[PDB]
Write a protein that binds this ligand. Sequence first.
Ligand SMILES: *[C@@H]1O[C@H](CO)[C@@H](O[C@@H]2O[C@H](CO)[C@@H](O)[C@H](O)[C@H]2NC(C)=O)[C@H](O)[C@H]1NC(C)=O
Ligand SMILES: *[C@@H]1O[C@H](CO)[C@@H](O[C@@H]2O[C@H](CO)[C@@H](O)[C@H](O)[C@H]2NC(C)=O)[C@H](O)[C@H]1NC(C)=O
Ligand SMILES: *[C@@H]1O[C@H](CO)[C@@H](O[C@@H]2O[C@H](CO)[C@@H](O)[C@H](O)[C@H]2NC(C)=O)[C@H](O)[C@H]1NC(C)=O
Ligand SMILES: *[C@@H]1O[C@H](CO)[C@@H](O[C@@H]2O[C@H](CO)[C@@H](O)[C@H](O)[C@H]2NC(C)=O)[C@H](O)[C@H]1NC(C)=O
Ligand SMILES: *[C@@H]1O[C@H](CO)[C@@H](O[C@@H]2O[C@H](CO)[C@@H](O)[C@H](O)[C@H]2NC(C)=O)[C@H](O)[C@H]1NC(C)=O
Ligand SMILES: *[C@@H]1O[C@H](CO)[C@@H](O[C@@H]2O[C@H](CO)[C@@H](O)[C@H](O)[C@H]2NC(C)=O)[C@H](O)[C@H]1NC(C)=O
Ligand SMILES: *[C@@H]1O[C@H](CO)[C@@H](O[C@@H]2O[C@H](CO)[C@@H](O)[C@H](O)[C@H]2NC(C)=O)[C@H](O)[C@H]1NC(C)=O
Ligand SMILES: *[C@@H]1O[C@H](CO)[C@@H](O[C@@H]2O[C@H](CO)[C@@H](O)[C@H](O)[C@H]2NC(C)=O)[C@H](O)[C@H]1NC(C)=O
Lengths: 324, 324
Amino acid sequence: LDCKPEFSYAIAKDERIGQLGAEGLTTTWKEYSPGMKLEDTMVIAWCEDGKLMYLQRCTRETRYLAILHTRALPTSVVFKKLFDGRKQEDVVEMDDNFEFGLCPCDAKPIVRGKFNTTLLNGPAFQMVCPIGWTGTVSCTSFNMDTLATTVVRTYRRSKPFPHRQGCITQKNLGEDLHNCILGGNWTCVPGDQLLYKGGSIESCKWCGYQFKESEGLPHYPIGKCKLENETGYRLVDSTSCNREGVAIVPQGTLKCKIGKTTVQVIAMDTKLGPMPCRPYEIISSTACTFNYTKTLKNKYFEPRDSYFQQYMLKGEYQYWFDLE
Amino acid sequence: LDCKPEFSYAIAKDERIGQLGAEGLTTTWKEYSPGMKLEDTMVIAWCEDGKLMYLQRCTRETRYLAILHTRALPTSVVFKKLFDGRKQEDVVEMDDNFEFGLCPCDAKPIVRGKFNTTLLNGPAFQMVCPIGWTGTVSCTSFNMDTLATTVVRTYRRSKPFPHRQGCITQKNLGEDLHNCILGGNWTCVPGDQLLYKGGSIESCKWCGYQFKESEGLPHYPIGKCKLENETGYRLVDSTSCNREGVAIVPQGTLKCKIGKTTVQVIAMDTKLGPMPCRPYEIISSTACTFNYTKTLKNKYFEPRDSYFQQYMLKGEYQYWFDLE
Ligand SMILES: *[C@@H]1O[C@H](CO)[C@@H](O[C@@H]2O[C@H](CO)[C@@H](O)[C@H](O)[C@H]2NC(C)=O)[C@H](O)[C@H]1NC(C)=O
Ligand SMILES: *[C@@H]1O[C@H](CO)[C@@H](O[C@@H]2O[C@H](CO)[C@@H](O)[C@H](O)[C@H]2NC(C)=O)[C@H](O)[C@H]1NC(C)=O
Ligand SMILES: *[C@@H]1O[C@H](CO)[C@@H](O[C@@H]2O[C@H](CO)[C@@H](O)[C@H](O)[C@H]2NC(C)=O)[C@H](O)[C@H]1NC(C)=O
Ligand SMILES: *[C@@H]1O[C@H](CO)[C@@H](O[C@@H]2O[C@H](CO)[C@@H](O)[C@H](O)[C@H]2NC(C)=O)[C@H](O)[C@H]1NC(C)=O
Ligand SMILES: *[C@@H]1O[C@H](CO)[C@@H](O[C@@H]2O[C@H](CO)[C@@H](O)[C@H](O)[C@H]2NC(C)=O)[C@H](O)[C@H]1NC(C)=O
Ligand SMILES: *[C@@H]1O[C@H](CO)[C@@H](O[C@@H]2O[C@H](CO)[C@@H](O)[C@H](O)[C@H]2NC(C)=O)[C@H](O)[C@H]1NC(C)=O
Ligand SMILES: *[C@@H]1O[C@H](CO)[C@@H](O[C@@H]2O[C@H](CO)[C@@H](O)[C@H](O)[C@H]2NC(C)=O)[C@H](O)[C@H]1NC(C)=O
Ligand SMILES: *[C@@H]1O[C@H](CO)[C@@H](O[C@@H]2O[C@H](CO)[C@@H](O)[C@H](O)[C@H]2NC(C)=O)[C@H](O)[C@H]1NC(C)=O
């Protein structure tokens, strides 16, 4: 129903009309206002403009609204029931996208469940992205004198939630993007690393050396490589950090160049082998004239010398020759 | 009977006195000399005391002495029979030293034997180095009236002549020494070249090029090689004058060396190989400097470039490199 300009209103717990008037009032009478509001310990209620509304502020006892025309007789009071009255204890199965929770009887939540995924604002409470959640939250309360304590209402989740609104489901552990197995924003219980489905890429990391462009590598992209918009690295390819006896590493022993990047490399074997990377510092010194560079045991950089149609190789250095 | 002063004497074959003299006369009449001698092709006589004595120089024709008294009629001569005219024949086996032949009755020899080995000086003849000859010369004689013809004596050699101290048994052709199967000085009917059983060589000939010294060959000596007492070459070996895909000839196409000697040489193939023979002229041309020479497509002379531990080959030239 609604409220009307010329009536008195009050609330009541039972309709019992005693001799003198309404017997079971909880409140004092109240004459109309466009936005009048009425108040007790089991309910609040309100009129807009133009309409009767309420918000049960606990639910153990049953409450009816009393109404009595301002002039009319006390024993003439009329009751429409606003919420039913029952006790004790509950369960509320929380729907797949249940988010904002709200306990009743100024009662503090107790959280049993799989993981942490909660925001407690007093007896209010909230599931922040509990994707993959199970547990049961019981709004209990404790008596200080007697150390007994008891619950009003349980909210059950036997089946795990699925995904939802703005629930970020990918975290950085160090520099690597990692999945979120369960939960979303900050309840991320992280998983396996993210694999590269595709995308316009900015940067590749391999063997502990970070590259921009296709140039020099067995293929591009390779190693692990991160997107422009994003923060961390997605897996791609675990190509081994060795290129036929010559392995590329942090530490030593001579420096060549891939694409634009510096690189250190050490040789594992001493047989004839191709250096993977283009070389660093090419030093010259026509009669016969010759450029050369430093190398490893038996390892040849391209290009071959045209003149001797071959890679030309003392033992430490690889040479190139022009004869006039 | 006897020769007296008041007579003339001559000799006759037939006892015939025809009209105007004797007919059978093989002389001109000889006036008495104390020591007159009469001579013809059958017999020769002499008067020593006035008594007569003669020595037949052949048997076949029967002869007389003619005697005409220096006054007398020609038609009155007389004759004494000096000796009879038996026509018999003999046969003669020549000593192993047999050397010089002699037919009798002014009789042409005609010769049957193995080869050419005779000098013919009318009715006498000569065997020049008849080494290993066999045959029969026979001193035949014609008659133009009767067209029969006959021999007086056959000289036989059934068994072949051995060699005989004074006969040269090896002929020189080109610069090659050659045996005489049959003959000696200029009757040499030559044979195979001489095999070199041993002795000091002055010069070897291999592949059309003359070597003095053991240096730079499979061994020494080799090919064909001529001794210090001699004039031409005895065969020793015939090592193939093509060497590991590269062959050595008169004309073309570049000149390497062995011992002190020049050698022309052509390529048998292209697939890599070893020469063998040092090279002609090494042309030089400080930082790096480089000596080199010309060569054969993929063929290398010794020694390698030490500095690269390998053979050093652009395509027509072999190089050696100095970084000091
Ligand atoms: C469960 O999740 C939240 C994550 O945000 C944690 O909230 C913090 O709780 C600590 C209590 O130890 C408080 O001091 C902070 O006020 C909260 N911080 C933030 C950023 O929210 C909560 O503690 C987690 N539960 C744990 C770690 O047991
Ligand atoms: C998880 O985080 C994201 C990003 O911070 C949240 O999405 C933004 O939330 C703000 C509110 O502050 C709104 O303006 C938009 O909905 C988002 N921002 C923009 C620019 O679009 C998301 O709501 C978070 N989820 C939680 C906390 O559960
Ligand atoms: C950065 O960019 C990639 C590639 O565009 C983003 O991937 C998008 O996100 C959705 C799912 O969240 C994918 O299905 C689509 O492929 C992408 N959408 C569009 C419109 O391109 C990725 O999420 C971004 N990473 C961030 C913001 O960290
Ligand atoms: C050795 O280094 C020199 C530089 O001093 C190279 O010189 C190049 O040679 C060409 C002609 O052959 C010149 O026209 C260019 O100006 C030079 N190019 C560059 C990129 O500098 C020489 O070719 C080098 N030899 C090698 C790499 O074997
Ligand atoms: C023995 O004597 C004569 C004269 O020397 C040889 O006659 C030769 O025979 C050839 C036939 O091949 C004729 O053409 C010539 O009349 C002769 N030629 C030469 C080169 O002598 C006879 O053959 C001699 N016996 C030989 C050479 O073995
Ligand atoms: C071949 O010719 C030579 C000389 O022109 C002859 O020489 C004689 O023979 C011996 C060899 O036994 C040589 O030592 C001497 O030159 C000569 N010796 C004497 C003792 O005079 C050789 O006999 C000739 N043979 C012929 C033509 O048949
Ligand atoms: C040059 O010397 C050789 C080797 O010595 C001579 O061969 C000799 O001759 C006889 C046969 O005539 C061989 O059986 C012997 O081997 C050699 N005899 C001696 C004593 O060494 C060859 O005849 C000579 N060549 C000439 C003179 O032209
Ligand atoms: C290139 O030719 C010259 C000859 O002019 C060689 O130089 C000689 O070799 C030694 C040591 O190698 C040098 O010390 C001398 O100056 C030269 N000696 C004589 C006697 O000339 C050079 O070694 C040759 N390089 C080659 C063949 O690779």
